[PDB]
Amino acid sequence: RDFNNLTKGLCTINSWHIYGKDNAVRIGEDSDVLVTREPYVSCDPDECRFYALSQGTTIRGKHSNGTIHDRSQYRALISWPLSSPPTVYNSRVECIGWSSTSCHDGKTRMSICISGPNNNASAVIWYNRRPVTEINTWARNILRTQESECVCHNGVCPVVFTDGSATGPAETRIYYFKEGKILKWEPLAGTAKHIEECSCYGERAEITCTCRDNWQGSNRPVIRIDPVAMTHTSQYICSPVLTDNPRPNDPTVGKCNDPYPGNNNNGVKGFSYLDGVNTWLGRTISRASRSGYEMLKVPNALTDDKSKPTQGQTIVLNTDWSGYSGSFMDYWAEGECYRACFYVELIRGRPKEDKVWWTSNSIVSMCSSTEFLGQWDWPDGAKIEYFL
Amino acid sequence: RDFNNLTKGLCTINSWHIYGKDNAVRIGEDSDVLVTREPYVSCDPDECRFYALSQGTTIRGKHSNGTIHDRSQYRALISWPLSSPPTVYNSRVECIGWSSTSCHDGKTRMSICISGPNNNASAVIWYNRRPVTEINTWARNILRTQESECVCHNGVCPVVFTDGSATGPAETRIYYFKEGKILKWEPLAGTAKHIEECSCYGERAEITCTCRDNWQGSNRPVIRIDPVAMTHTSQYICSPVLTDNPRPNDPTVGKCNDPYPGNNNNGVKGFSYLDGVNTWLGRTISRASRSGYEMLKVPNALTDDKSKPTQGQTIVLNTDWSGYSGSFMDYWAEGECYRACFYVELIRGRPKEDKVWWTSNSIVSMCSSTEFLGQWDWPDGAKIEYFL
Amino acid sequence: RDFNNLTKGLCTINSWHIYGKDNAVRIGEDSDVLVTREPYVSCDPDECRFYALSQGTTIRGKHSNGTIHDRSQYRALISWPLSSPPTVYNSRVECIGWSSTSCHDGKTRMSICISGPNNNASAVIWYNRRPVTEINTWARNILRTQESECVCHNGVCPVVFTDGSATGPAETRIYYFKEGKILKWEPLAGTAKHIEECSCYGERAEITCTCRDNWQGSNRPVIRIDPVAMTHTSQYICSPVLTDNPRPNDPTVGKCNDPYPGNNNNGVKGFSYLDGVNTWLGRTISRASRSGYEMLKVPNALTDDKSKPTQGQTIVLNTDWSGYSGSFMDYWAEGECYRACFYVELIRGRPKEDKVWWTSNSIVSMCSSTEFLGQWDWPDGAKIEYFL
Amino acid sequence: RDFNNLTKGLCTINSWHIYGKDNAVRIGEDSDVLVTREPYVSCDPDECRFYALSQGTTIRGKHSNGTIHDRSQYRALISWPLSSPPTVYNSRVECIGWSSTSCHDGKTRMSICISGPNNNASAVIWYNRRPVTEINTWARNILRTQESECVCHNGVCPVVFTDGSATGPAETRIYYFKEGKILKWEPLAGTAKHIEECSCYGERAEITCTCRDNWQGSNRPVIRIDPVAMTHTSQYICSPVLTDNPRPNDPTVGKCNDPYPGNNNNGVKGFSYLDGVNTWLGRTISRASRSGYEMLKVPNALTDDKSKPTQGQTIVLNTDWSGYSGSFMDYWAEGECYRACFYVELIRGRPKEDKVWWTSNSIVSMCSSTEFLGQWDWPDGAKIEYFL
Numbered sequence A, B, C, D: 001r002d003f004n005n006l007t008k009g010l011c012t013i014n015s016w017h018i019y020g021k022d023n024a025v026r027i028g029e030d031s032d033v034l035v036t037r038e039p040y041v042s043c044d045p046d047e048c049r050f051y052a053l054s055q056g057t058t059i060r061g062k063h064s065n066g067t068i069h070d071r072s073q074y075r076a077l078i079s080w081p082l083s084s085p086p087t088v089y090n091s092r093v094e095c096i097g098w099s100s101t102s103c104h105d106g107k108t109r110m111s112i113c114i115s116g117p118n119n120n121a122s123a124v125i126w127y128n129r130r131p132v133t134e135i136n137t138w139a140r141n142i143l144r145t146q147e148s149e150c151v152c153h154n155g156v157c158p159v160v161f162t163d164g165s166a167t168g169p170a171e172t173r174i175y176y177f178k179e180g181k182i183l184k185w186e187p188l189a190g191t192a193k194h195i196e197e198c199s200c201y202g203e204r205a206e207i208t209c210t211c212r213d214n215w216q217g218s219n220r221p222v223i224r225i226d227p228v229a230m231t232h233t234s235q236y237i238c239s240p241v242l243t244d245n246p247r248p249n250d251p252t253v254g255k256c257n258d259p260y261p262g263n264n265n266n267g268v269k270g271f272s273y274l275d276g277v278n279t280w281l282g283r284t285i286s287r288a289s290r291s292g293y294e295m296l297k298v299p300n301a302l303t304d305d306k307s308k309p310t311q312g313q314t315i316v317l318n319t320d321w322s323g324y325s326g327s328f329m330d331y332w333a334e335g336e337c338y339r340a341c342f343y344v345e346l347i348r349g350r351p352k353e354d355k356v357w358w359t360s361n362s363i364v365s366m367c368s369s370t371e372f373l374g375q376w377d378w379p380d381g382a383k384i385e386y387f388l
């Protein structure tokens, strides 16, 4: 009942442990499970929940033929209990739309959904289950946002939005909201060239997002936000350990304020926890496909342009599919520091498994441990052949 | 915990944004979704909910053959969470009956359901989940009511009921209830000739319903109710922009106190927000069929008999089906004024899609914005051919 | 939070209105609805709920073949929300057993379930969701109880139990419980010859049950209980309007303290509200089969042995099946008097509809009105042929 | 809201009554019921719940082929309402893992789940729905725990864990936790040679577990724990009434501090309530297979090495399958003493019913009575042939 404030620093990440896995596509072969994609996790003062953009069909239903398409009037942001599947009967609709972000401010939740045609789309900001604010497209070419949770400090919750070309310069703005109302907005500043899908976290009153340059870098851009002064900056992660996908081989030296060239016009949503020596970067194992997933500790990745890994942990092996990943923490857990967590989308169906007509996913999430725990790999686990 | 009072005026409607869509018939192709019709939306102090008259079968179940019929013992008023489908497992039964209305008074909810044979039907008024009052038919030919929400001011909630011919003079009464008990009732007064299905809203202690003349007008009747004095009046909307269906072409001049002739004995439930310059009228695009849906701003429509549109927004295109529409507002939202909202029923199956044996629907709702947002069209989205 | 006390008298019953109908077997043709029988209704301080003995299968599931049998280890007492069907996902298990009764005492609920072989059965009394007391069989031949709700006054809730022959003399006892513990029990007294399945209600600190003589009467026995003194008496209803089934024609004169002969060894659970001039008796229309259902007002039925009906209302027509019926009232409704209510079981499947292999039912309930409302008939409504 | 303390002694067990039965596999033939095994029951201050390790498929779904295997990434600890089946829509996920234990401390619940490869597995301890502590494998060969509930006294909840060979010496430790944090741990002491799966209960501030020696005894080991001093001891049950399975014939004399030889390398989870004269031992009726189940009163079984039964009760007959059984009590029931309770797993499918490709189960539980109640047998009740 009073606003949350980013008081603590991150605990030290010596390894990762399972947090949630829902086995959605497995159980969807014989249950009324919704078709989704763009998943993420967000916590309330009293519970943590799984989130996704629905496609408005079940996996086994006939209107699943066609759900590879990204934007439509039948998608919505839904949430369901931790480690359960997105079922028709157990899901809660947050807002209607095909791009989204959501966070709790300590008092209540803000969710944002965008719908529209490509050239005349709008966002409407819901606070405490009601509509309060709406924003129309400014550059008229697919107004989009984070597709993962936002973060708040004493009432002000910043959200990044891009509008325009995915393949050239675009127009990006950071909006600062408080109780659903706009307090201020700014256009992108600093050296990042293109922004798409930021994954954010906060600690000691500052917010760090790791985004996706779709235009030209294979290294990732970082926006650092100060929620009290309401300002930001961008840079790229210095380290030569490249984490977009597709990507060239990792070099010996990296780039701090310019894109690393090699692949143009394509990518994936990813994240990193940037904390001096305690820094871990997540990435696909395949340099060409969204397959496999690994976590790599690369001390000072943001600043040291010659930093190489020191420790690692395999989350999904290279023979199984992965997808989008993002960052969340439970800011209301008891303790001296915030425990870092993440999720990875495990996509099944088209384009790669084109033997079915649908595209859906399950989720795995992980949080950190100060211990050095042994690892296991966490694949989706369905057999596509049962759906034929 | 104290009665709600209509204190505020309506905000200004410069455009409309999506509020809820449930994609019911799509998900019903492979889920246990109930067959409905006559949908509507109503809010409580803490949540808003979707409502409909059930037919007592699922879409894919065999007893769906025949659900084009309107009155039977297997129908009931049910409600379910906002933007979810009317599922067997997630629905709450309010009362049993084939005509209905419901509203919350700030303390608890009143729901009214009517059942009976055509010539010996009765209403029973439920307040706080219990039966309190019952009313028997007065003219002995299908006692019916609004099929959308009612509105209350400091305890008194007025409901319009018609009993008698749908094709001639009928007998209409406005009942004023407080905590489920009748305080007073009056017969219809003013110049409206026939009343059927009123859609109502309230602002600054007055209640405005826009009803359907089934006998002879293609322009709509308006009943204005004063809940403190408990009195009313009726008129027709002056404007030549005609909003019943079927209807003749729009004329150059309209009628304020007489039906506009052209079609007899047929129509549809509709609504309008009548607020001086801030007035918007909803209607089907097809003049002959319940297809398409548009919102048109017609300044002073109620009084100016030569008023033409000034701005518009397309809700459903003319190639897709629509149906009944109604008005609601969330009287418990924070803010200086009430935000105007509406829903449109999207009917699928018989009579027009006679290639199946059932009749069902989904819902779309919209609320207003002070912004000028771009539009999208919101069709049901099922493919009838998957049900064959 | 303090015990309920039977303070009020019954309102006057000038007619009956629908209360709940669940359309269970209809929706069970394509949903996961449980197979039941022996239904009833009971209210809490804040909600009223439907109740039944489950058979541990769904209608469409394969283990429904065989559910005509009455006693087994797979049955349980379950409850679900008013006017919803007994679904696998929406039902709450009260206790395990094949005979039962339940009531709320103003503080919490007592439910009683009996399980066992025919010759070594036991009751275990649950109070506030926990086991507190157990009772073993005293005559060793199917220990059974009411199969409808019990009634409490200031803590003491009396329950009737029979143990022994259904076709001769048996041993019946009235147990008086308070918070789940036995306070006292007595054997049957007065002139009733055989007791089976009592339906009870209470008003002005006295409790009236109308039971079933299975041995030899076609008129029904009445046990009157004083919950403060903890004593009772039995008699038969004097009136010649006979309400068991099967039964001979109604005579001109009836019997107050002896069975009316004509049918031996068979019957049905029924009820009556006995209140001087305000007395209404329920019965099947068929004298030979459990088909049809009617309510008949027979002034002073209990005492006047030559009393004939004065007013009636048809609940289910003679061409549709009915079954067991019982009495309940919502003792926590606002008002000056208790509104009388009842339910009728609508059995479908074997023995009469032997073209399927299962036996199940739906429910209809009704409460009274001081008005004279018109009637409708309320049949189950499924078509057996869809299950073939 | 203050920690629970084991204050009472056990009531006297003169017989057992049904508590819960869910009929899971029966209803699973036509419902969305999850495949499980290793079931158990645990109570909260306000409700008791059924628990199991899920396999991440439904019975009728295709990925049920293969669920005989014990460890995988698709299993999780789930709970659902008492006497309902583990349904996709009604289950709550506690933690992810293939071995587990859980108990409520009077303030909130601790659940522990283990996942990993055989040689690099870890436990993570959840307290109040969040991760707090993690423990890595110490002997690197399937780190496992109780698979039934743990017990707490004034904050400290002891858990037994084994890591290492199931067929030789292993390494067992008792961890003492308070609010999810480790207070202390000790290695096994006393005369028990091998520990696996302990079933525990507590009364008058001491905790008694009855475990399974997988290496060589057919008599069972007992660990007695003092939660204030945080220490323990082990012994074997003296009595010649042998309760592991498989097992040799019961001898005339038993062993108190050595394994009884006869079968090596195999067994089953079981339990006993050890209370002087009031002592009852549970066991399979088959000496060779997990079939049938009986309860036997063997006065002073723990100490008297020549003790024979004095009274018995058959729970499941020898022609039907049983499986794992464990102990729980509802420490928050009103009363002067704790009522002893237990559950038995009823396994269906492979290995014995190899005509299907899946392995699943239902549950029966029982609590004690001071009465001498008659018995019934409680089999699963599905017919495997309906699944073909």
Ligand SMILES: *[C@@H]1O[C@H](CO)[C@@H](O[C@@H]2O[C@H](CO)[C@@H](O[C@@H]3O[C@H](CO[C@H]4O[C@H](CO)[C@@H](O)[C@H](O)[C@@H]4O)[C@@H](O)[C@H](O[C@H]4O[C@H](CO)[C@@H](O)[C@H](O)[C@@H]4O[C@H]4O[C@H](CO)[C@@H](O)[C@H](O)[C@@H]4O[C@H]4O[C@H](CO)[C@@H](O)[C@H](O)[C@@H]4O)[C@@H]3O)[C@H](O)[C@H]2NC(C)=O)[C@H](O)[C@H]1NC(C)=O
Binding pocket: A240, A241, A248, A249, A250, A285, A286, A287, A294, A295, A296, A308, A309, A310, A311, A312, A313, A372, A373, A374, A375, D119, D120
């Ligand atoms: C029990 O559980 C424990 C805990 O999990 C297990 O122990 C863990 O084991 C992991 C696997 O070995 C290990 O992870 C590796 O750590 C390496 C860092 O360690 C180095 O330092 C130590 C000490 O400082 C030295 O002793 C040691 O010699 C090491 O050099 C990482 O280097 C590993 O990551 C790299 O390998 C994997 C696959 O093997 C690649 O996918 C990954 O991308 C890394 O390699 C690429 O990238 C680097 C950086 O640019 C390149 O230099 C390199 O050549 C590779 O480049 C190619 O590949 C990428 C991606 O495909 C491509 O983009 C690029 O262009 C090139 O093509 C790895 O992270 C854990 O650290 C260890 N944990 C602990 C606490 O010990 C234990 O094994 C389990 N089992 C048992 C039975 O106990």
Ligand SMILES: *[C@@H]1O[C@H](CO)[C@@H](O[C@@H]2O[C@H](CO)[C@@H](O[C@@H]3O[C@H](CO[C@H]4O[C@H](CO)[C@@H](O)[C@H](O)[C@@H]4O)[C@@H](O)[C@H](O[C@H]4O[C@H](CO)[C@@H](O)[C@H](O)[C@@H]4O[C@H]4O[C@H](CO)[C@@H](O)[C@H](O)[C@@H]4O[C@H]4O[C@H](CO)[C@@H](O)[C@H](O)[C@@H]4O)[C@@H]3O)[C@H](O)[C@H]2NC(C)=O)[C@H](O)[C@H]1NC(C)=O
Binding pocket: A119, A120, B240, B241, B248, B249, B250, B285, B286, B287, B294, B295, B296, B308, B309, B310, B311, B312, B313, B372, B373, B374, B375
């Ligand atoms: C991005 O999003 C924005 C926001 O949505 C989009 O901008 C909107 O675009 C809408 C479509 O053009 C527009 O809506 C129209 O507005 C007209 C009013 O504008 C007039 O005034 C302006 C300024 O004052 C003038 O500049 C302009 O010249 C206009 O004259 C309405 O007139 C329109 O409604 C009529 O047309 C539609 C179909 O086109 C009909 O269905 C509708 O019923 C109206 O026409 C019938 O009725 C009238 C009244 O009787 C008759 O006079 C007329 O002849 C028609 O009559 C026949 O049809 C009816 C029904 O079928 C039948 O019953 C009758 O008998 C006859 O047969 C329409 O409402 C928005 O106002 C505009 N919004 C804003 C804020 O700008 C933008 O386009 C999007 N796209 C991009 C890429 O940016």
Ligand SMILES: *[C@@H]1O[C@H](CO)[C@@H](O[C@@H]2O[C@H](CO)[C@@H](O[C@@H]3O[C@H](CO[C@H]4O[C@H](CO)[C@@H](O)[C@H](O)[C@@H]4O)[C@@H](O)[C@H](O[C@H]4O[C@H](CO)[C@@H](O)[C@H](O)[C@@H]4O[C@H]4O[C@H](CO)[C@@H](O)[C@H](O)[C@@H]4O[C@H]4O[C@H](CO)[C@@H](O)[C@H](O)[C@@H]4O)[C@@H]3O)[C@H](O)[C@H]2NC(C)=O)[C@H](O)[C@H]1NC(C)=O
Binding pocket: B119, B120, C240, C241, C248, C249, C250, C285, C286, C287, C294, C295, C296, C308, C309, C310, C311, C312, C313, C372, C373, C374, C375
């Ligand atoms: C609109 O709605 C309103 C409200 O519902 C409708 O009005 C109601 O209409 C009902 C049907 O007529 C009516 O119910 C009947 O009431 C009779 C009592 O009325 C008598 O008194 C009035 C005034 O005092 C007199 O004017 C009138 O002449 C009457 O004599 C009951 O007698 C009726 O019950 C009997 O008939 C039914 C079927 O018709 C039997 O099933 C039932 O069992 C009763 O008859 C049997 O039992 C008696 C008693 O032993 C025997 O004497 C008799 O011969 C029958 O015996 C045989 O049958 C039984 C059972 O099968 C068997 O066991 C036995 O052995 C024999 O074989 C009936 O209850 C309502 O009272 C009336 N309500 C009001 C408020 O007016 C209106 O019609 C609707 N429609 C429209 C368009 O408005």
Ligand SMILES: *[C@@H]1O[C@H](CO)[C@@H](O[C@@H]2O[C@H](CO)[C@@H](O[C@@H]3O[C@H](CO[C@H]4O[C@H](CO)[C@@H](O)[C@H](O)[C@@H]4O)[C@@H](O)[C@H](O[C@H]4O[C@H](CO)[C@@H](O)[C@H](O)[C@@H]4O[C@H]4O[C@H](CO)[C@@H](O)[C@H](O)[C@@H]4O[C@H]4O[C@H](CO)[C@@H](O)[C@H](O)[C@@H]4O)[C@@H]3O)[C@H](O)[C@H]2NC(C)=O)[C@H](O)[C@H]1NC(C)=O
Binding pocket: C119, C120, D240, D241, D248, D249, D250, D285, D286, D287, D294, D295, D296, D308, D309, D310, D311, D312, D313, D372, D373, D374, D375
């Ligand atoms: C109504 O309900 C009531 C209540 O349930 C019913 O009454 C109950 O009836 C039960 C069945 O008879 C009865 O249970 C038995 O109790 C025996 C103890 O009673 C003895 O003492 C009394 C009084 O002190 C004496 O009068 C009497 O003579 C008895 O000797 C137990 O001994 C019974 O258990 C043994 O038998 C069963 C099967 O019959 C075995 O499965 C079980 O394992 C026990 O026998 C094996 O084990 C012992 C110990 O080592 C061996 O000595 C023995 O030879 C057996 O060994 C073989 O089998 C085991 C397992 O297969 C194997 O491992 C081993 O190697 C050997 O191969 C049994 O528990 C209740 O006590 C009684 N309750 C009450 C309150 O009275 C009533 O019948 C119901 N019906 C009606 C119509 O009323």
Ligand SMILES: *[C@@H]1O[C@H](CO)[C@@H](O)[C@H](O)[C@H]1NC(C)=O
Binding pocket: A002, A003, A004, A005, A106, A154
């Ligand atoms: C956060 O900080 C503000 C301003 O310092 C304070 O009012 C608020 O109570 C703090 N939040 C909490 C949960 O203490």
Ligand SMILES: *[C@@H]1O[C@H](CO)[C@@H](O)[C@H](O)[C@H]1NC(C)=O
Binding pocket: A065, A066, A357
């Ligand atoms: C999916 O749709 C395409 C055309 O859009 C059609 O050819 C194809 O056969 C459909 N797939 C299935 C399995 O229905």
Ligand SMILES: *[C@@H]1O[C@H](CO)[C@@H](O)[C@H](O)[C@H]1NC(C)=O
Binding pocket: B002, B003, B004, B005, B106, B154
């Ligand atoms: C509405 O008005 C009445 C009478 O003026 C007043 O008692 C009531 O409290 C008001 N409602 C609210 C919510 O303030």
Ligand SMILES: *[C@@H]1O[C@H](CO)[C@@H](O)[C@H](O)[C@H]1NC(C)=O
Binding pocket: B065, B066, B357
């Ligand atoms: C629906 O009912 C009609 C007769 O009422 C029957 O002829 C028709 O075939 C039925 N339709 C289906 C699909 O069962």
Ligand SMILES: *[C@@H]1O[C@H](CO)[C@@H](O)[C@H](O)[C@H]1NC(C)=O
Binding pocket: C002, C003, C004, C005, C106, C154
């Ligand atoms: C019922 O009567 C008892 C004894 O007179 C009294 O204590 C109790 O409070 C009464 N119940 C209620 C709800 O008032």
Ligand SMILES: *[C@@H]1O[C@H](CO)[C@@H](O)[C@H](O)[C@H]1NC(C)=O
Binding pocket: C065, C066, C357
């Ligand atoms: C039901 O069981 C009987 C034998 O008990 C069997 O002959 C019959 O065919 C079964 N009915 C169905 C539909 O399976």
Ligand SMILES: *[C@@H]1O[C@H](CO)[C@@H](O)[C@H](O)[C@H]1NC(C)=O
Binding pocket: D002, D003, D004, D005, D106, D154
């Ligand atoms: C348990 O004992 C502790 C220490 O004596 C005490 O503080 C606690 O309140 C007791 N628990 C309860 C429920 O009384």
Ligand SMILES: *[C@@H]1O[C@H](CO)[C@@H](O)[C@H](O)[C@H]1NC(C)=O
Binding pocket: D065, D066, D357
């Ligand atoms: C199960 O899997 C095996 C191979 O793992 C396969 O041969 C078998 O036919 C499968 N069973 C079924 C019913 O699919």
Ligand SMILES: [Ca+2]
Binding pocket: A212, A213, A214, A215, A216, A217, A218, A244, A245, A265, A266, A267, A268
């Ligand atoms: Ca890129």
Ligand SMILES: [Ca+2]
Binding pocket: B212, B213, B214, B215, B216, B217, B218, B244, B245, B265, B266, B267, B268
């Ligand atoms: Ca009309």
Ligand SMILES: [Ca+2]
Binding pocket: C212, C213, C214, C215, C216, C217, C218, C244, C245, C265, C266, C267, C268
């Ligand atoms: Ca009889």
Ligand SMILES: [Ca+2]
Binding pocket: D212, D213, D214, D215, D216, D217, D218, D244, D245, D265, D266, D267, D268
């Ligand atoms: Ca052993």
